Structure formats: structure tokens, C-alpha cells
């Protein structure tokens, strides 16, 4: 045949792949973690958004740290040979490098390691997307007025907030980041490469949101998400 190029992931496998959504709203009393009002809005928005991208969505609610690890292990042991990609969305409390089960923390590294190039062979060379709405610390952004392959390759971490910072969630509308992500996927998934979609998410969160609080410490604060890409190709959710 004619000249060929290989700059974008193959996304025309029979299935787009799994979209695992872990929605932790209510936490064991002994942890002292507050309930995450608005997270069900996020979880429903994500389910619909990824449904329309033809992902096989599985929603899981209020999982312990043990249940999170067992779920990820079991999912990583499935046969993904007929699937183009893998998506995991984590909605919970967190700190840098950590997301919380209902009864205590899980290292993000522990979760993603199940999907390493050498440990999930049916996803080797396929994009593995982790979307994280969770705090990464307690900093607040005040704003300013205006061949082998590496085992860590082909991961993308779409973080809601910069390293070290809180992440903002509205109890009525959902989280700033998930709201914006679903809106941009809805509008641009048939149009733009994924990094360009996430850049528009960055701009939407950065420009359209500002916190309102009766507490001066938490009032008038801003947020920027953080795209961490170890992908090796362009990612389009559509195919020719």
C-alpha cells in the first residue's frame, strides 16, 4: 500500500476498553474524613461522557483500601486484547501520591503498577489513562489578576490540581475539574487530540472557577490541573 505513518495510538480495536470509576463519597467515621458532597454528580457525568465515547463503564461506590486494590488487581488480570485503551477515574480524598479508600489510604503507585507494561501484557503499548479528582496536599492558589519499551510508558495521569495543592469540589455542581473535563470531552472528543482537550480543560478550570467561602483562608482561591503524560503517541477517541 501507500506511505504509512504511526503517530497515533490504534483506537479501532473491537472495544474502546474499560472505564473504571471509583466514587468514594462516605468514609468510615474513625478516619475522620468528611463526606464528599457533589461527587455523585461527577460520577454520573463521567459515566455518561465515557458511555458516549463507547467505553465499558463500571461505577464502584465507597470502596475500602482493600477493595480498591483487589478491584484494580482483578481488572489488570482481565484479557484486554480486544480493547484499545484503559481508563480509571478516582474520586476521593487524597494527598500527594495517595488516594483514600473509605478506611485509609492507597498509594497511587500501587494501583498503577498493576497495569505496568510488563505486568498487564494485553495493555502493553496501549494508552492507560488515570483521571484523579483528589487533593494533593493543602496548598491554596491565591491567583493573580489579569525492542523493549519502558514499563512506565503509555500512562497518562490527568490530575485535577497541581502537586501539593487542594482540589476544589462544589457540593451542588460537582468538582471543578470533572465538570470541565466532561464538558470538553463532550465538545471536542470528535475533533481534538487528547492533550489538546486536556489543555482546554486546564484553561476552563483556570479561568471560569474561583472559590467562595465565609472563611478568609479558603476564599477567592484558584485551581490549575496538571497533565502528566508518559504517552508515546497522539490519542484520538475517534478513528477513520
Amino acid at each position: 500500500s501507500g506511505i504509512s505513518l504511526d503517530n497515533s495510538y490504534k483506537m479501532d480495536y473491537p472495544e474502546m476498553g474499560l472505564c473504571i470509576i471509583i466514587n468514594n463519597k462516605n468514609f468510615h467515621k474513625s478516619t475522620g474524613m468528611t463526606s464528599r458532597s457533589g461527587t455523585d454528580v461527577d460520577a454520573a457525568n463521567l459515566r455518561e461522557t465515557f458511555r458516549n465515547l463507547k467505553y465499558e463503564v463500571r461505577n464502584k461506590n465507597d470502596l475500602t483500601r482493600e477493595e480498591i486494590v483487589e478491584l484494580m488487581r482483578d481488572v489488570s488480570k482481565e484479557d484486554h486484547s480486544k480493547r484499545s485503551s484503559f481508563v480509571c477515574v478516582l474520586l476521593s480524598h487524597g494527598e500527594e501520591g495517595i488516594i483514600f479508600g473509605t478506611n485509609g489510604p492507597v498509594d497511587l503507585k500501587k494501583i498503577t503498577n498493576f497495569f505496568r507494561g510488563d505486568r498487564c501484557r494485553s495493555l502493553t503499548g496501549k494508552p492507560k489513562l488515570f483521571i484523579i479528582q483528589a487533593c494533593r496536599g493543602t496548598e491554596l492558589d491565591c491567583g493573580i489578576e489579569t525492542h523493549k519499551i519502558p514499563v512506565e510508558a503509555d500512562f497518562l495521569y490527568a490530575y485535577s490540581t497541581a502537586p501539593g495543592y487542594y482540589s476544589w469540589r462544589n457540593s451542588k455542581d460537582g468538582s471543578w475539574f470533572i465538570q470541565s473535563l466532561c464538558a470538553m470531552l463532550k465538545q471536542y472528543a470528535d475533533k481534538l487530540e487528547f492533550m489538546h482537550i486536556l489543555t482546554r480543560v486546564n484553561r476552563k478550570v483556570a479561568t471560569e472557577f474561583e472559590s467562595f467561602s465565609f472563611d478568609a483562608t479558603f476564599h477567592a482561591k484558584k485551581q490549575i490541573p496538571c497533565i502528566w503524560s508518559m504517552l508515546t503517541k497522539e490519542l484520538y477517541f475517534y478513528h477513520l
Partner: peptide, 4 residues
């Protein structure tokens, strides 16, 4: 608005 709440933080996670």
C-alpha cells in the same frame, strides 16, 4: 465550594 469544598476541598478534597
Amino acid at each position: 465550594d469544598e476541598v478534597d
